[PDB]
From TrEMBL, chains A, B, C, D, E, F, G:
Gene3D superfamilies: 1.20.1260.10. Fe cation 2 binds at residues 53, 96, 129, 132. It catalyses: 4 Fe(2+) + O2 + 4 H(+) = 4 Fe(3+) + 2 H2O. The lineage of its organism: Bacteria, Pseudomonadati, Pseudomonadota, Alphaproteobacteria, Hyphomicrobiales. It comes from Brucella abortus biovar 1 (strain 9-941). GO terms for molecular function: ferric iron binding; ferroxidase activity; heme binding. This is Bacterioferritin. InterPro entries: Bacterioferritin (IPR002024), Ferritin-like (IPR012347), Ferritin-like_diiron (IPR009040), Ferritin-like_SF (IPR009078), Ferritin_DPS_dom (IPR008331). One of its GO terms (biological process) is intracellular iron ion homeostasis. Heme b binds at residue 54. GO terms for cellular component: cytosol.
Length: 162, 162, 162, 162, 162, 162, 162
């Protein structure tokens, strides 16, 4: 018996890790920019989401090592950095769709190759990303309906607690 | 002695139940839509009002069974589903006026037929619906005065607590 | 990228919602009847199960809206209303088998169409319904073995706590 | 201005008091008999119901004195005393129907004569009696369905807590 | 649908408000006079009753606004100000009878015009006023039986707690 | 509707139970041997793992009964009993690989036959066994790197707490 | 007045960030490898040090944004990944010396250009890195003196708490 994973499974896991490290760093930078712009409420959520992506990355790393593969943390996927509140949300949403599409294909490859526990891991990440797509599309819907300046005000703190 | 109710009283009670199940379901769907649109504060109130209508439905069911009638939960009254915040409030208000008018006529029929305890039940529901008409007309007054986009912002949560 | 679901997936979700609203209402009416008949212990469980079905309905509604579909709360599936304790259990069991069969087919359609998160939702509901089929078949087994009158007594409260 | 009530209103109030003192005493004796027969659970409920009828009697006495009438506590309405559990419930039910019919007629006379606060008092007692008719008819339904001996066992305590 | 009340209903509500503001002010002045005269116990009750009348006034104001009428707080009904303890009680009693008679007629007009929730409000105020007529007639009965000077002493505090 | 499972599904469930009872007993005996040899820390973990396998066996038994099959607890799979610390870990690892391979094939058969809830149960056990394979391969890696005598010392308690 | 930093200062800050993201990822992977190898005590320290490097990265990001520069999180410095405990410590030490040398040069450039607050930030990071060089050189000294296998045993947990 051996836990040596399928090379294609470890590749999909590393591709997920590539995207996850990009998302961690994009959310963390969006956090710092949003805070510097005054949108301290959205910034706090952005930092929470960076941390959620760190947990995803950690689960992927752990699974690759268990499959006796080598996790690649040397590179991170292309960042999309926004220059105003709406661009930040739109950039996050595009990265979420990239993750969604990647994990859907990955769960299918793991299933086809008989690695059902890795398949399960991609199924859990897929559900998590769809939840965050929910959130981001809701925020962009709200921003369109009440307008960007009111959306920014709603997500800014007053000066005595900024 | 017999608790067998007047057929016309059980009919009025079932007509109230018909409307009440419609209101439960309309408020619950309005809850889920409002939340998905970002108006998490109005959504929470909408869900509270759905639950209040469930309690009305439950009292009606209990009274019909006590009168040895058969409660009908198979059908629900026509739903009015809004597509923006103002339409949601307007749709709820129309259903409240339907309930108000139905319960006013029902208290009169129960009184005429000598079922004063059923009459009392319609009197309590009538007062409750008028309270909710108060609330909805106040919210629509506020929305007209400060404008729909500011009313939406007021009833939305920031992103770190949405 | 788009969260617009497959029309056939939203149809299966709405078909589940149709059945779920029927189950909510059947369990709630069975609750009120059982209580009126004196079987206050079985009534309390029936009301708990109605609430469990409300949570199922709520998850389905939320998923349909996320897929940008329109949840239908206007109609509810045909109710089976029992006229004694055993008929109540038998009627609930038939509705559970309807839900089981519907969700099994739905998980297969979602899987075939590539909506694995909706598939997951049907998988969780399927497990939940099978648990309730377990319970109902156990209760009907007990009722057959100790007899209906002893089963009724076991599930009735004494008069000072009824 | 004068609080001197209508003679016919005080008569209806005294007629209610007549019935209420009969119900107090019938429930209290049924309590002591049921306990002596071993049905300690039903006995405890019977004693609770005697006390509920004492509160009704007290409200009637207070209202008669406020109307400057003279409450009659010299006589009590005919008691119906059962000789087994089912007869006790049937006897209580007959007295409840007597009270119900009396209070319905009394609320109508008070209303016709313009004493709306006395009318209200009869409306509250009417609702209370209908609740107790609910309870008694439920218990008699249960007794018929599981049988009198099982109903007695259900409402008896074991010997170490009788 | 419209909550625009019947003009005659708003008139009755405003007539009640007229009397209620008079009662508030009469009880508050009677409070201050009684205290200045040394009857600190009766004064405290008088101030409590002023506050109870404020709550009545507030309910009336709220109902008029809900009916889309305009509450009139510009005028207050004629005050009856006593110059000794017995005159204070007699003056309060006369105002209570005025309120009682006004609310009885008002509940009848609201009922006739189909505004059963306003009718209910007058029914609740009517019961409340009859309770206070009870109290005042009891106090005047006591004052006649033990004599005015003993009644005054009973309702005065000693000098170290006056 | 019927919960009568596929005969091949109950066979796979019973095959899992066969292996699980073997693992329970192998871990429990390894516990007692390790303790007797002085390796009280590894012994405590071994006993914890026996109990984890008991929970697996219990879930399988429950599922077989729900499918109206008959759980077989008469036989247990071949035990591999080690005679030193490294052999104990190697023997546990071989049994874990047997369980892993059995559950992977079983999830595939349940899926093919349309029993997705039984499939889910094998998916959860599969993930659990892979976690324990992780642990055992890590311990064997550590034992090779620091040497068996140091690994034994690390997993022994001092004499005043052995 | 303007907070627009010197381009060369932002370059040094971004060069520090480049190294810091490499250190975060190297420590996090070393954490997961060490844990998988059984050295759970050293793994926990490695994860703590990854987090310390995250705080350094965060301070650098914040300072770059304050200087109106653009933080680069797209690339990370070359990782040195060890394949046994001693190589892990040696690889961490080499990265620490790279950071030390980079921050020493950076504090000198910031000082020369008159950005004393950025200079201060490099001075604080420099002190922090020298503390971690202290730790790593101490651990490598200990490993040489007691031997690698005893150093590994010392930094491994027993099986009941691994
Ligand atoms: Na993620
Ligand atoms: Na605003
Ligand atoms: Na209602
Ligand atoms: Na009337
Ligand atoms: Na369900
Ligand atoms: Na599949
Ligand atoms: Na009574
Ligand atoms: Na008043
Ligand atoms: Na197992
Ligand atoms: Na650092």
């Amino acid at each position: 018996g051996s836990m040596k994973g399928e090379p294609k499974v470890i590749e999909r896991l590393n591709e997920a890790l590539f995207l996850e490290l990009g998302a961690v760093n994009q959310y963390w930078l969006h956090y710092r920019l949003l805070n510097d712009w005054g949108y301290t409420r959205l910034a706090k959520k952005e930092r929470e989401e960076s941390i959620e992506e760190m947990h995803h990355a950690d689960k992927l790393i752990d699974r690759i090592i268990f499959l006796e593969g080598f996790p690649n943390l040397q590179t991170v996927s292309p960042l999309r950095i926004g220059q105003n509140v709406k661009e930040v949300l739109e950039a996050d949403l595009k990265g979420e769709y990239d993750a969604r599409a990647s994990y859907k294909e990955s769960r299918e490859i793991c299933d086809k190759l008989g690695d059902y526990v890795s398949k399960q891991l991609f199924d859990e990440l897929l559900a998590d990303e769809e939840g965050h797509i929910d959130f981001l599309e809701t925020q962009l819907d709200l921003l369109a309906k009440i307008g960007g300046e009111r959306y920014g005000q709603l997500n800014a703190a007053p000066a005595d607690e900024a």
